[PDB]
Amino acid sequence: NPMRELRIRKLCLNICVGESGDRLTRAAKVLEQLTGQTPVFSKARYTVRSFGIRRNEKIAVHCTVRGAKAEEILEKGLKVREYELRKNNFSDTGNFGFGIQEHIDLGIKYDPSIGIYGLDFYVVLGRPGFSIADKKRKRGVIGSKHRIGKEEAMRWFQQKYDGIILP
RNA sequence: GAGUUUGACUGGGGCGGUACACCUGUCAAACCGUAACGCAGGUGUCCUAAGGCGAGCUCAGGGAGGACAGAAACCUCCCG
Ligand SMILES: [Mg+2]
Ligand SMILES: [Mg+2]
Ligand SMILES: [Mg+2]
């Protein structure tokens, strides 16, 4: 039945910078040029002396795309990765992700003002009906025979993009 | 030189301690109450919100994941 078709719920991009300041506000404009929307700064939960991060200090930026624009950014991300992901990239909960080492390959032209940054592409899959565990009125679990496994996630990647999955 | 004062509790007194005004657990023996210089601790503060109300949200931790990134940075899902 068509009520089991795997789809892209959201594409969550993450640029975790080591420190704040001008170095962080440059990465915010990178996600704005790619996702076309204002990013969200993530403050540090705790303080780490070795990492050089203080509590409640913005160190990262993240976005999330839902509609056809999420498939656009994923296609540009999978093109840089040559449409091949390792078998361990797929989580047992049905999701997967990969890392991009430089945003210049995604379609953003390099400029001397802002530096080069690496993103963190993570795709959250789902079936039509996965919203029952997120709504407030009459919330319910998804179900055993309806949640996506690791096998269906890898098979979906080998069919929509015909990607290669290395052992 | 004159007058007066130089606390109390206290296994004598002094020294020490404050059991001297208060709070929690226990002692305490299933109502309450109940002693010892019994036991283990706290108090002379702090807060324009850490008061009041409404709304949304869910925590600790763990599993699986995801460029740098690692036993600990951030993103995601699941259990909780
Ligand atoms: Mg006399
Ligand atoms: Mg006496
Ligand atoms: Mg009693």
CSV table of C-alpha atoms (C1' of nucleotides) and ligand atoms in Angstrom, one decimal:
chain,number,residue,atom,x,y,z
A,1,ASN,CA,0.0,0.0,0.0
A,2,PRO,CA,1.2,3.6,-0.7
A,3,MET,CA,1.1,4.3,3.0
A,4,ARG,CA,4.5,2.8,3.5
A,5,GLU,CA,6.6,4.8,1.0
A,6,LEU,CA,9.9,5.9,2.5
A,7,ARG,CA,10.5,9.6,2.2
A,8,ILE,CA,12.7,12.4,3.6
A,9,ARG,CA,11.2,13.9,6.7
A,10,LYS,CA,14.0,16.5,7.3
A,11,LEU,CA,17.6,17.1,6.2
A,12,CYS,CA,19.5,18.5,9.3
A,13,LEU,CA,22.7,20.3,8.4
A,14,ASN,CA,25.2,21.1,11.2
A,15,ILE,CA,28.3,23.2,11.2
A,16,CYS,CA,29.9,22.7,14.7
A,17,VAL,CA,32.6,25.4,15.0
A,18,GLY,CA,35.2,25.1,17.7
A,19,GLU,CA,34.7,28.6,18.9
A,20,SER,CA,32.4,31.6,18.7
A,21,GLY,CA,33.1,35.1,17.4
A,22,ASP,CA,33.7,36.2,13.8
A,23,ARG,CA,34.6,32.6,13.0
A,24,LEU,CA,31.1,31.5,14.0
A,25,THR,CA,29.1,34.3,12.2
A,26,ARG,CA,30.8,33.3,8.9
A,27,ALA,CA,29.4,29.8,9.2
A,28,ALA,CA,25.9,31.2,9.8
A,29,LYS,CA,26.0,32.9,6.3
A,30,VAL,CA,27.1,29.6,4.8
A,31,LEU,CA,24.0,27.8,5.8
A,32,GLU,CA,21.9,30.8,4.7
A,33,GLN,CA,23.3,30.6,1.2
A,34,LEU,CA,22.7,26.9,1.0
A,35,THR,CA,19.4,26.4,2.8
A,36,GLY,CA,18.0,29.8,2.1
A,37,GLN,CA,16.9,30.3,5.7
A,38,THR,CA,18.1,31.8,8.9
A,39,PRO,CA,20.3,29.3,10.9
A,40,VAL,CA,20.0,28.6,14.6
A,41,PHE,CA,23.0,29.0,16.9
A,42,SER,CA,23.6,26.2,19.4
A,43,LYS,CA,25.1,27.2,22.8
A,44,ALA,CA,27.4,24.9,24.6
A,45,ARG,CA,25.8,22.7,27.2
A,46,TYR,CA,28.8,22.4,29.6
A,47,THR,CA,32.2,23.9,29.8
A,48,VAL,CA,35.3,22.1,28.5
A,49,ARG,CA,38.8,23.4,29.1
A,50,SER,CA,40.5,21.3,26.3
A,51,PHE,CA,37.8,22.2,23.7
A,52,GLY,CA,38.0,25.8,24.7
A,53,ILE,CA,34.2,26.2,25.1
A,54,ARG,CA,32.2,28.0,27.8
A,55,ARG,CA,28.8,27.2,29.0
A,56,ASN,CA,25.9,28.9,27.2
A,57,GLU,CA,28.2,30.0,24.3
A,58,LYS,CA,27.1,29.6,20.7
A,59,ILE,CA,29.6,27.2,19.1
A,60,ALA,CA,27.5,25.7,16.3
A,61,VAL,CA,24.8,26.5,13.7
A,62,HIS,CA,22.1,24.1,12.4
A,63,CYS,CA,19.2,24.1,10.0
A,64,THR,CA,16.5,21.7,8.8
A,65,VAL,CA,14.8,21.5,5.4
A,66,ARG,CA,11.5,19.6,4.8
A,67,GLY,CA,10.1,20.0,1.3
A,68,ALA,CA,11.6,19.6,-2.1
A,69,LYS,CA,14.5,21.9,-1.1
A,70,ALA,CA,15.7,19.1,1.3
A,71,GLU,CA,16.0,16.8,-1.7
A,72,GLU,CA,17.9,19.6,-3.6
A,73,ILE,CA,20.5,20.0,-0.8
A,74,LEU,CA,20.8,16.3,-0.4
A,75,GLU,CA,21.4,15.8,-4.1
A,76,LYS,CA,24.2,18.4,-4.0
A,77,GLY,CA,25.6,16.7,-0.9
A,78,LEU,CA,25.5,13.2,-2.3
A,79,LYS,CA,27.1,14.5,-5.6
A,80,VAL,CA,30.2,15.5,-3.6
A,81,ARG,CA,30.4,12.1,-1.9
A,82,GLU,CA,30.1,10.5,-5.4
A,83,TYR,CA,26.8,8.9,-4.2
A,84,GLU,CA,28.5,6.4,-2.0
A,85,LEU,CA,28.1,5.9,1.7
A,86,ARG,CA,29.7,3.4,4.1
A,87,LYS,CA,27.5,0.7,5.6
A,88,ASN,CA,28.0,2.1,9.1
A,89,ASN,CA,26.5,5.5,8.1
A,90,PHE,CA,23.0,4.1,8.4
A,91,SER,CA,21.7,4.0,12.0
A,92,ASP,CA,19.4,1.2,13.3
A,93,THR,CA,16.6,3.7,13.7
A,94,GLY,CA,16.3,4.1,9.9
A,95,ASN,CA,18.3,7.3,9.4
A,96,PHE,CA,21.7,8.0,8.0
A,97,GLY,CA,24.2,10.8,7.4
A,98,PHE,CA,27.5,11.9,6.0
A,99,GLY,CA,30.1,14.6,6.3
A,100,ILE,CA,31.2,17.2,3.8
A,101,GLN,CA,34.7,18.6,4.4
A,102,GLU,CA,34.3,21.8,2.4
A,103,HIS,CA,31.2,23.9,1.5
A,104,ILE,CA,32.7,25.1,-1.8
A,105,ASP,CA,31.8,21.8,-3.4
A,106,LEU,CA,28.1,22.2,-2.6
A,107,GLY,CA,27.7,25.2,-4.9
A,108,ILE,CA,28.9,28.1,-2.8
A,109,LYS,CA,31.7,30.1,-4.5
A,110,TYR,CA,34.7,30.7,-2.4
A,111,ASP,CA,35.3,34.2,-1.1
A,112,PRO,CA,38.3,35.7,0.8
A,113,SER,CA,36.0,37.2,3.4
A,114,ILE,CA,34.5,34.0,4.9
A,115,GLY,CA,36.7,31.0,5.4
A,116,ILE,CA,36.1,27.4,4.4
A,117,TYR,CA,33.7,25.3,6.6
A,118,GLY,CA,32.6,21.6,6.7
A,119,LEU,CA,29.0,20.6,7.1
A,120,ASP,CA,27.3,17.6,8.7
A,121,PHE,CA,24.6,16.2,6.4
A,122,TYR,CA,22.1,13.9,8.3
A,123,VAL,CA,18.9,12.6,6.7
A,124,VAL,CA,15.9,11.6,8.8
A,125,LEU,CA,13.7,9.2,6.9
A,126,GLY,CA,10.0,8.3,7.6
A,127,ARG,CA,6.8,6.9,6.3
A,128,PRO,CA,3.5,8.7,6.0
A,129,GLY,CA,2.1,8.4,9.5
A,130,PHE,CA,5.2,9.1,11.5
A,131,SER,CA,3.6,12.4,12.8
A,132,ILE,CA,1.5,10.5,15.3
A,133,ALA,CA,4.4,10.4,17.7
A,134,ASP,CA,4.9,14.2,17.5
A,135,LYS,CA,1.4,15.6,17.8
A,136,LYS,CA,0.0,16.7,21.2
A,137,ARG,CA,-3.6,15.5,20.9
A,138,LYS,CA,-3.8,11.7,21.1
A,139,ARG,CA,-0.1,11.0,20.8
A,140,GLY,CA,0.8,7.4,20.0
A,141,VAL,CA,3.8,5.2,19.2
A,142,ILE,CA,4.7,4.5,15.6
A,143,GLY,CA,4.5,0.7,15.8
A,144,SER,CA,6.9,-2.2,15.2
A,145,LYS,CA,5.9,-3.1,11.6
A,146,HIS,CA,5.9,0.6,10.6
A,147,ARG,CA,9.2,2.0,11.9
A,148,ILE,CA,12.1,2.1,9.5
A,149,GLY,CA,15.0,-0.4,10.0
A,150,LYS,CA,18.6,-0.2,8.9
A,151,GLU,CA,17.9,-2.6,5.9
A,152,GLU,CA,15.0,-0.5,4.5
A,153,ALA,CA,17.1,2.6,4.9
A,154,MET,CA,20.0,1.2,2.9
A,155,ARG,CA,17.7,-0.3,0.3
A,156,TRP,CA,16.0,3.1,-0.1
A,157,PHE,CA,19.4,4.7,-0.7
A,158,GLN,CA,20.3,2.1,-3.4
A,159,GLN,CA,17.0,2.8,-5.2
A,160,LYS,CA,16.3,6.5,-5.2
A,161,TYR,CA,19.9,7.5,-5.9
A,162,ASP,CA,21.3,4.1,-7.0
A,163,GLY,CA,24.1,4.7,-4.6
A,164,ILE,CA,26.9,2.2,-3.7
A,165,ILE,CA,27.2,1.1,-0.1
A,166,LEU,CA,30.7,0.0,0.9
A,167,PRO,CA,31.2,-2.8,3.5
B,1,G,C1',41.7,57.3,94.0
B,2,A,C1',36.1,55.7,94.3
B,3,G,C1',32.0,52.6,93.0
B,4,U,C1',30.6,48.3,90.6
B,5,U,C1',30.9,44.1,87.2
B,6,U,C1',33.6,40.0,85.4
B,7,G,C1',26.5,34.8,81.9
B,8,A,C1',24.5,30.0,82.2
B,9,C,C1',24.5,25.0,80.8
B,10,U,C1',28.4,21.3,82.4
B,11,G,C1',29.0,13.0,84.5
B,12,G,C1',33.2,18.5,90.2
B,13,G,C1',35.3,22.9,88.4
B,14,G,C1',38.2,25.2,84.5
B,15,C,C1',39.7,24.6,79.4
B,16,G,C1',36.8,22.8,75.0
B,17,G,C1',32.0,22.7,73.1
B,18,U,C1',26.7,25.6,72.6
B,19,A,C1',23.5,20.4,73.3
B,20,C,C1',21.4,28.9,75.0
B,21,A,C1',17.0,31.1,69.6
B,22,C,C1',15.8,27.7,65.3
B,23,C,C1',15.4,23.2,61.0
B,24,U,C1',15.8,17.9,58.8
B,25,G,C1',16.6,12.4,59.4
B,26,U,C1',16.9,9.2,63.5
B,27,C,C1',16.6,7.9,68.5
B,28,A,C1',11.0,7.4,69.6
B,29,A,C1',9.3,1.4,71.3
B,30,A,C1',3.3,2.1,63.9
B,31,C,C1',-1.6,8.8,66.8
B,32,C,C1',0.7,13.1,68.9
B,33,G,C1',4.4,13.7,72.8
B,34,U,C1',9.1,11.9,74.9
B,35,A,C1',15.5,12.8,77.6
B,36,A,C1',21.3,12.7,77.5
B,37,C,C1',27.8,17.2,76.3
B,38,G,C1',22.6,10.6,71.9
B,39,C,C1',23.7,10.0,66.4
B,40,A,C1',24.2,12.4,61.0
B,41,G,C1',23.6,17.4,59.3
B,42,G,C1',21.8,22.6,58.5
B,43,U,C1',20.8,28.2,60.1
B,44,G,C1',21.8,34.4,61.3
B,45,U,C1',21.3,33.8,54.2
B,46,C,C1',19.6,34.0,49.1
B,47,C,C1',15.9,35.9,45.1
B,48,U,C1',12.6,41.9,40.5
B,49,A,C1',12.5,36.8,40.2
B,50,A,C1',14.6,32.1,42.1
B,51,G,C1',7.7,36.3,43.4
B,52,G,C1',2.7,35.9,40.3
B,53,C,C1',0.2,34.1,35.9
B,54,G,C1',-0.4,31.9,31.1
B,55,A,C1',1.6,29.1,27.1
B,56,G,C1',4.8,25.6,24.9
B,57,C,C1',8.4,22.2,26.0
B,58,U,C1',10.7,17.4,28.9
B,59,C,C1',14.8,15.7,32.3
B,60,A,C1',19.3,12.3,34.4
B,61,G,C1',21.4,8.7,31.6
B,62,G,C1',21.9,5.1,27.6
B,63,G,C1',22.0,3.0,22.4
B,64,A,C1',22.7,3.8,17.3
B,65,G,C1',24.4,7.5,14.1
B,66,G,C1',26.8,12.1,11.6
B,67,A,C1',33.5,16.5,8.3
B,68,C,C1',37.3,18.2,11.7
B,69,A,C1',35.5,15.6,16.5
B,70,G,C1',38.7,12.2,20.2
B,71,A,C1',36.6,8.7,26.7
B,72,A,C1',33.7,14.2,27.1
B,73,A,C1',32.0,20.2,21.9
B,74,C,C1',27.5,20.1,18.2
B,75,C,C1',23.4,17.8,14.9
B,76,U,C1',19.7,13.5,14.4
B,77,C,C1',16.7,9.4,15.9
B,78,C,C1',15.2,5.7,19.6
B,79,C,C1',14.6,4.1,24.6
B,80,G,C1',14.1,6.7,29.0
C,1,MG,MG,33.6,44.6,95.2
C,2,MG,MG,28.6,27.6,86.5
C,3,MG,MG,5.3,8.7,67.6
